Amino acid sequence: QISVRGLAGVENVTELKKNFNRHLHFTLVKDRNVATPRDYYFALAHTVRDHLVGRWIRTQQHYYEKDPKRIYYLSLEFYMGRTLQNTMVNLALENACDEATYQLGLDMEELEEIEEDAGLGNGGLGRLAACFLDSMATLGLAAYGYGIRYEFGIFNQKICGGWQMEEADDWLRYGNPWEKARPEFTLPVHFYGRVEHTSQGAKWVDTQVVLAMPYDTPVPGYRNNVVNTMRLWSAKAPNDFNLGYIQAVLDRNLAENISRVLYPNDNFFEGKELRLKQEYFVVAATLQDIIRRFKSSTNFDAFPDKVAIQLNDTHPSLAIPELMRVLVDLERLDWDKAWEVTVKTCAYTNHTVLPEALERWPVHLLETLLPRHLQIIYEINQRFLNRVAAAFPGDVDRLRRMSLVEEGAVKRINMAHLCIAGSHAVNGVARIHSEILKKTIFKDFYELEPHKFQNKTNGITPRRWLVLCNPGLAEIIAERIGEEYISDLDQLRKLLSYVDDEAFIRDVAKVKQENKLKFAAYLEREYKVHINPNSLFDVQVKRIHEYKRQLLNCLHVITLYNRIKKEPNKFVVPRTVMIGGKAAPGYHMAKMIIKLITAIGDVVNHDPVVGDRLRVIFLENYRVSLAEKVIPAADLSEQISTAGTEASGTGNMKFMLNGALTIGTMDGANVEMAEEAGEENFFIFGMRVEDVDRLDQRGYNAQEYYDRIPELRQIIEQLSSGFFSPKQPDLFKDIVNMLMHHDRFKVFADYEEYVKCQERVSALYKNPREWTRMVIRNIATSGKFSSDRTIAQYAREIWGVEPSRQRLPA
Amino acid sequence: QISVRGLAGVENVTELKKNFNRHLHFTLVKDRNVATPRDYYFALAHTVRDHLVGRWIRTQQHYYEKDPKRIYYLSLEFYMGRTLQNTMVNLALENACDEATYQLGLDMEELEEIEEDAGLGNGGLGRLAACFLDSMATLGLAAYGYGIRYEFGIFNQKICGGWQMEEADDWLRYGNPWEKARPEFTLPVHFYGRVEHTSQGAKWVDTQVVLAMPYDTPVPGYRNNVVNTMRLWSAKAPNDFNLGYIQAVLDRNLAENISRVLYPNDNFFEGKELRLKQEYFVVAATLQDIIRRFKSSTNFDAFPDKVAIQLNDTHPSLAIPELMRVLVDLERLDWDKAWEVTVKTCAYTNHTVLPEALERWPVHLLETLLPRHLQIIYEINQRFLNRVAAAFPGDVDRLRRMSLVEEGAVKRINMAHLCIAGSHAVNGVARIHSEILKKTIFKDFYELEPHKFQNKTNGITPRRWLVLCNPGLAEIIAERIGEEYISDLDQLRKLLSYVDDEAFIRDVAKVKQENKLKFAAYLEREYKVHINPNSLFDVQVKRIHEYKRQLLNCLHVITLYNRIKKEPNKFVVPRTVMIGGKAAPGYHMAKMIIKLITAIGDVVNHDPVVGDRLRVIFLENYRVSLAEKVIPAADLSEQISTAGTEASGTGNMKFMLNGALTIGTMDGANVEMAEEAGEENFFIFGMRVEDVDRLDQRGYNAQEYYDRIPELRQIIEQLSSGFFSPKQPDLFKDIVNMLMHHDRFKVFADYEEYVKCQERVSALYKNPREWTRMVIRNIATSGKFSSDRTIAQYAREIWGVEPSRQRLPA
């Protein structure tokens, strides 16, 4: 049908068809009179997976003979979403399968909707890992994703009376065709025990054994025939385990609980044992697998020339003392040499500065669970602090601030400090985030080893985030400048000469118009809710957090409402405000925000006076596959975190690529996006990082804003008095209370500038042509935000390998 | 190679080869440089399963249009063993796959050894169900096996210092190619709750829901292209289940524990909740599935003309009040009519008279767990007792004996009584067992409804128990009389005219000689133990029970030893005594017997004087696939239960079919085997049922035997004094104590007659030719003991359907 989707060969269409019928019959054991769409989804998924394997096997083979340096991406999160379309796209099968399935009298699009998301992540950090995997394959790196195969991923969110209900994501219920169990590479992981000292050195003994079984999932490069591996570990109990009899067998579940469920906070840090066991589990299994692969090439000097280990936040920080443990206790290298090898292997990526997000494990936990790792850690600390002392003699304060060991009512290990000490590179995820790292929380460490600190601004993959979710726009781009930009997104910069082209302007607008219409229909079919598609689509999607300030959005929305009710017969640019995201289950405030959002909807969507001029929708169950639908349909992208809190953001980049304009603060990667497009083509408002520090150091008094802004005063009053909760008048007292007395995120301080900036957005929207020309300037300068750029920078500046765009043979 | 194994076509061999390589590559994702035999086993298993499916689908289709009466075989046990060879055999692919795998440079026999047993049963009752399934398919009945898919089957037995250790049977670890998950037919099962009464009748409410997910496994008929289904249910928790968050997800395991593990007693009855939940679980899911199938043909009058439900012991007895519950509470038929439908649907098979094996559920358990089923049961009891009262007016004793409700310190429901009241036929499993039923435990019930009581002597399938495990003998039979006997085992009777044929005599002996040599090699390779293959192979294999009297065997073995040590220079016919079987984990005595057996081995196998004249081996991990090896290699089959305790036995039949002679008591099916072969061709010794009753009614005093038999006195003394346990002299005090003061099974009373009969066996063995002629008379009269006969009798006399031997089209 459309050309970016590949060739529909006459042979290809014919083979696809017989293979689809083979799987229906042999694999699924159905015939065409009993098959449901689920069966049809499966036969198609099996048919496409068939095309992967030859490549998968050939790619693993290449790495064996070439023996290149290997990259291990360690993460507790992989937010993959659906696999089928992405696979078709990277293999250039999309059009063929469309044809092939059409002639069988099926609608492929309807089949795609049947696939469960692999929701093995919470948000940005999980999804980065997924983009990175796609980019790594596409750039021909010999790279492995390693994580945990959670039986249950991020919970499905239901709204019941405006409240979030959590229910379990049973994503494997119907099976998962993409994975291949490999019970033959199962590995022991040890816990508890104690440490004995010999003549021969330390020994870890009387441990409980949990087995780790890997599952391999193919990660196909973009049209280069590279297929890399994502290996995910599953917990199994051993057979003699506990081994009255019945109970012993049932208790096998204690061991297997390790891989049962993904922890769903991205707000906070909970010092729960189960979580630490998951962290140790992925790191022990992964390192033995790494070492094993290294042995099949005594000599650990070359180890850093063959192995690179990237740590995605501190979650797998135990890789460091675990690598030491192996090298020292098992291979019997001396400390200094093992330590050299470890630092040259490991590198660390930080994703936040919020102090409550930092991992600080209680020492009593590590002592019971990992007694040897604590020994190694104390030894790491001691030797590190002697370097500190020697470089800053007499500075006893530096020494307490820099310790990997925090004193206090309970001793904790600061995991971030561990990663800096034992890594050769530490990076932030957007330029301002990396500066803040150097100037505030890791200032001491930076003064000690400035060479360790780097920046790697995040990106998103344009395969999923443009070609896949937005074929219309990818096609009209490709009409003008070719297809080469799909793996070289810098070429989008050539759309700049199309800024005054009348045909392009019309086409860009037409695609947006189509995505809006299609999404509005998705809204009626799947959730029975009813929106004007001529309105501006104002969307905020992302996890619910105080620092992301969905509340600031709420205050605007309430203001628009109030101004409509004051002069109801005046013209306003109509808007559909859509807000979505999950709250971590125990994050009370986050759950209150979701309730407010639906409560505003109950009032605004049912005022006869408001008409279809304002609508407030809370988008239920935000997740990767919902983002693929809502992002292309958006006009306004809301990125309104308080300056200095959002490390990078990546949602922001998805929207830029897809033809929304951005209203946002100079936070995170927003800064670089505006720098790339021109501040004129951006809606920037509010405090800069500096303004926030000025406010802090004199004190944030929220009362001041309440006193000078009558529009604001009114809103707080409606909140307090029961306007939005007529049955429980005091429902929102916590929010009003927080906003007034202990807002760490200064919602009121940005309110005035935000509302004004919002009026400027409405003003540009009244002029369709000028709105679209601005869109074009945005879409055209989005090239920097490809994860191909990001990964190429990691590769050269941290891992020491060279990207390759060259096809492997089919 | 050999002709019973089918054609090696040139096309067949060629297709098998490409399909094997397709699965290796596409399904297993290996290539020939990394594949292990496990991978090779799998590609072959996938290749053979391919040949099933077309037939599986076509067979289900036939039943849809023909709409015949359907048989549901309900059992908590299916002791299947390996599937691959059996599948090849029934499909006539054996020789082709042998050829096909030979040309790939693989040894198929070595690949077969990789398949795990499906050990979803304990012993005879589980394995009967499996034979029955094969026979049902072979006779073209539209029959379904229904059970539970246990995650862990019967434990693997390890001997450690002569003691049984149990370890978990993780049979699904590497996957199971034979099954097809069907998450689309998942069904709710309810527990707990309470009963509300309406104007509209009873309602069961506030229940916990556990979902039951079915797995379908193909059951292929013998060369008739019929493929029937074994459906096994798996427990899954619902998604809103319990639904702080983490714990709620982890607790999903409480619900799923229902299908986690098979209970391993066949001795006793344990009134454990988990077990009752398994019983309810299989019965609720199965009946809804049955009813659903019946609805796709309001009118439940035809229900008994369309549905037959066979209950394998009382384990699924709740089918009865569950069928009532559905019919009365959900479909709103009146009681009398539902009850009529239920009785005409259900039939019951009893497998023992031992009072401690009988299910008697505590009323407090049923009240909490299944409150409505208890109501139905009380109503069943009441209406039943009015029939009793009316037929035997004034007999208040009959009334207490017949009640489904037993009074006593705790009230119990007697599940056997339930099955008789609510079934149109009750059967025993061998002729003497059925008489005993009528004369003792169900005498009252028989007087009430004599027409309900029938006999169905057990059988074994000659596909697994001859063609598969003993190709040598099947071939030499087939040389003389054709292949038709494989599904008409009565034809073996024609071997009677070959009794004086010198060539046959030589061939029968040669095959036995080959199986012995091959098994002796299996003994050295896999368990490093070392046996003279010219000895008589004396084997007792079966679960360890006091009533099966492995102890009586021990006393013989100790006697042979003692006589050798008295006159060491005299000739004795050398013997290898082999004894194997598992003990239920909490059955202390059973575990003591295993220890004695190995302890006798520690003495006898290391006496220089004994030489290779006596050897005692305990065969570890007895299970279906070990039986396939040891049975064909045996000379003497030991079936030495006390008269009146072994309901039928089926091991006994396997040995008869495979050329062992039988030493046994007139117990169970032994009686009919000797009746078929002639008592002259059998080694019968000991008390008859009648003799046991005479001994009881005057009192069994074991001291009497100890006083008059000095050979016996000696053994007890060696036992008591530490002869067989020099380090713990008092180790066996429990056994000596039981034997002397409270032997319920009268081991001493049969000792004299057994030892004498053993001398007669040794005497015949000195004359090879006459031994073999007797073997031939045994093998030749084994036809009655085919499960084809048995199932044909069930079909005509209980289910009311006609067997069909006619091929379905390929």
Ligand SMILES: CCCCCc1cc2cn([C@@H]3O[C@H](CO)[C@@H](O)[C@H](O)[C@H]3O)c(=O)nc2o1
């Ligand atoms: C037990 C630990 C629980 C809390 C730790 C945590 C930090 C954090 C950061 N980010 C995002 O990581 C994204 C990828 O770098 C980035 O774009 C976003 O700015 C950043 O907020 C994220 O998505 N989730 C994370 O959870």
Ligand SMILES: CCCCCc1cc2cn([C@@H]3O[C@H](CO)[C@@H](O)[C@H](O)[C@H]3O)c(=O)nc2o1
């Ligand atoms: C919770 C309940 C636990 C104990 C109930 C039980 C009875 C019983 C009978 N049989 C055999 O069933 C075989 C099949 O009929 C038969 O040949 C054997 O003679 C008979 O002993 C068996 O194998 N296992 C059974 O367990």
